[PDB]
From a paper:
In this work, we advance the understanding of this complex by solving the cryoEM structure of the full-length 16E6, E6AP, and the p53core domain at ~3.3 Å resolution. To aid in structural studies, we adjusted the linker between MBP and 16E6 to be more rigid than the one used in SPR experiments. We modeled the 16E6, E6AP, and p53core structures into the electron density, revealing a ‘Y’-like conformation, with E6AP and p53core flanking HPV16 E6 with the individual 16E6 and p53 proteins superimposing well onto previous structures. The interaction interface between 16E6 and E6AP is significantly larger in the ternary complex compared to the 939 Å2 LXXLL peptide interface which expanded to approximately 2,361 Å2, or ~2.5-times larger, contributing approximately −13.23 kcal/mol binding energy. Approximately 65% of the E6AP primary amino acid sequence of E6AP spanning from T126–G761 was resolved. The C-terminal lobe of the HECT domain (residues G761–Y852), which is essential for E6AP’s enzymatic function, was not resolved in our structure. Although 16E6 and E6AP form a contiguous interface, we divided the interaction interface into three segments, labeled site 1, site 2, and site 3. Site 1 is composed of E6AP residues, E403 to D426, including the reported E6AP LXXLL motif (residues E406–E415); however, in our structure, the LXXLL motif is protracted to encompass E395 and E431 which extends from, and is perpendicular to, the 16E6 hydrophobic groove. The site 2 interface is formed between the α-helical linker between the N- and C-terminal 16E6 lobes and the E6AP α-helix between residues S503–Q515. The site 3 interface occurs between the C-terminal lobe of 16E6 and a β-strand directly after the α-helical linker connecting the N- and C-terminal lobes which form multiple van der Waals and hydrogen bonding interactions.
Residue numbers in the entry:
A (entry chain A): 8 to 147
B (entry chain B): 98 to 180, 188 to 198, 202 to 223, 228 to 259, 263 to 290
C (entry chain R): 126 to 170, 233 to 386, 394 to 432, 439 to 761
Write the structure that this text describes.
Amino acid sequence: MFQDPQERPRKLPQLCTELQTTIHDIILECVYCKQQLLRREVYDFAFRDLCIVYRDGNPYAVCDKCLKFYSKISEYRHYSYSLYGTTLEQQYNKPLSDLLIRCINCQKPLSPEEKQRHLDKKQRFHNIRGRWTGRCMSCS
Amino acid sequence: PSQKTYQGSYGFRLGFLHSGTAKSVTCTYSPALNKMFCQLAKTCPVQLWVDSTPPPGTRVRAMAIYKQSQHMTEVVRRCPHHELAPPQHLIRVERVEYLDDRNTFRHSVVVPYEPPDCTTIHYNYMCNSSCMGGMNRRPILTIITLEDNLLGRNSFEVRVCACPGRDRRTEEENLR
Amino acid sequence: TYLTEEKVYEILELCREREDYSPLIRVIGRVFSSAEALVQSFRKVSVDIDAIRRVYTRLLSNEKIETAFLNALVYLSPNVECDLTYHNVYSRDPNYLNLFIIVMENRNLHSPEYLEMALPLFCKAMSKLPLAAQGKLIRLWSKYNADQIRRMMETFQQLITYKVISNEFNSRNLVNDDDAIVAASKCLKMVYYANVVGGEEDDEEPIPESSELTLQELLGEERRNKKGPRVDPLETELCRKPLIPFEEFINEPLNEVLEMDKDYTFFKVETENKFSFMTCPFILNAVTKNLGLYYDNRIRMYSERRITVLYSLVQGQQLNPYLRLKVRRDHIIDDALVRLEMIAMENPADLKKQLYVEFEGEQGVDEGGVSKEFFQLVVEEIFNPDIGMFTYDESTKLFWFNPSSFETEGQFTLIGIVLGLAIYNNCILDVHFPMVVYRKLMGKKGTFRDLGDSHPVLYQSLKDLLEYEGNVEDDMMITFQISQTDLFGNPMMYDLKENGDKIPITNENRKEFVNLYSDYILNKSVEKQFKAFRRGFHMVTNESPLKYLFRPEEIELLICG
Ligand SMILES: [Zn+2]
Ligand SMILES: [Zn+2]
Ligand SMILES: [Zn+2]
């Protein structure tokens, strides 16, 4: 359906509006295990700001199990180093609220209260495959 | 009023700052709703990402339309209460050019594109999403078109309310 | 008190006219104990370092003056140490760096008098300098001659040596929490980079991934990811030849009290008050760097083992925790190339496991010796003249690539992977490669200056052409189209210009003729072969700190021993 290379909706709400449907009336296939996603899984895929993956022109989501599993695999495989929040702020010359730091298990981007919880509790942000990750309160 | 997402030849896409659901936040973004909540006359950080650098002269144009089907046919006029900013152009950017359509009279805020890891443009909104005589609780879609003539397009709903903290949480929990 | 040359001299002759130097002692004590005065003192008519040297020459002959200098530096230092941290002045005053280039001219810094408490305090106060100030200071130091760089090197080498000898370092009291050594080495980093600065590039391509690539599509990080723990004081300034040799920074007394078991921890997870002595790796010995790389490459093996454990847990898949080869001894290339090709296709990040390479027809438990045996078998059969892949300069006993070797691209990738796996799991080989090989691996092409290793018989001829004072156009008449003969007897006339056989050489064209001829000899003749070689080398050690820890000159020591 979306076999065009430079025409296709990258995220879930754009996919919903170009498919004449809503986020409540869609059935999506996980790109890893090729299974359907439940209501809470497409809601979480929306909240986590994850792109829709297109295979053979078909749009694909990711269920909870494959997301957490391959995030854990990539954490083991591609870990680089853990830096402090203050060290990150002094290194990137930007505050933590101006940097994209995702969760390390579920890949949900961190709201500034979670980054402030890392800073207050003296926890570290880990560099995985060149991208910085932390830990949201849901996974902590 | 073509809201259709077009990554373009250069992979144009829009990013936003996940500024949280604080009680005192002035601007926040919700990816589930794809809505950029904001506070009147406050900072709107919209980041532009491209896969390839476009040629110079690239025009990032902001055009606001209405989201509803019956309301796309008439332009978002500035609220009559507010009529340094011009009384006719809704979205403000904080050299920047402004265009009006010759037939349908649509306000387009045109900025020359500049390469940086993301071109962060600060937009501003000057009327509430509950103004009288203007929006009157009509949801708006802001369309950001990287066009030199189109080389890319994206869009997002916008709400300009009394507090972007309560309503973002409320709307996200009505979605879920 | 805006001190200059004239104030110091006027006070000096006022002291000698009364035959008592008390005004000089009180002035030097009360001015060099305050950070504010030295910033505004000794300005050009924004600082006259030569005039500070002149003042020190005309002043430091008296013991009372110099001990006042010592005590004043002791007073000055902690109020600047608790000033760069608790406050910030260099951001609001670019002149503040004057403070650190007036007390550095003190010749008694390189002396045991300043060793106990003056220099530790000063280097602690200077250790917290902001990164732009460090860049400006290194830029200033880079212009100094070799003797002054040696003096600034030995000034902190003495302090590190003294603080290591004087402090007893068991495993419970490490060098990481001793602020004197940490500050001295973090200030010696400045001298190392000044040596680098004051003292041609390849075209890299990375490797893909199988399952994590889809995750990269999901997150949107698909364009180009970043890699490297590369130092903070870089990309502020600029691979080159130094002013002082790089071995001089190898602090041997510190390198025998380090603990890389604990130092690698603070290198991979950043503890606050614990310095990791691989951020400054130039003070690391060969055994110490090899130890750190060994710990890194064993932690990676344990991570891959845990990955296969997870795959055994959830999905029920069975995955081999080792890079389990199976090569018939009669055919090592033909039976290792196909296995490495299959593993490189299906699971690119499977070459980062423990190598297990057993032979068919015999059952051996791989305690390490069997992998070794596979390695000398590979080095024997790759470097033989029958396969026709490497030529052997017997005048230097060095192995260099063959310009006339075709359809062996997979085998050059194989020997690249052999070197990568060799470095990876702690294996030492016998490869007689010139140093141009060990630089072209890291990403730097080879210059004419390094034709002396690979092809000396031709490098000497090129150099004799270079400084030949007579007119070269009418003496040898060498054209730009070079004259090289193949081993087959056929000519292999290569073109360096569109009219190379029609344009004669001149006394001005020889300078670039030499550097295009060298480029053809060791960059363009072996372009496909080295492209395959370097891809094979990179695909095993792409996630490794080898480009960060190990200089090209100290990688021949890593493989050949
Ligand atoms: Zn799945
Ligand atoms: Zn999480
Ligand atoms: Zn209004």
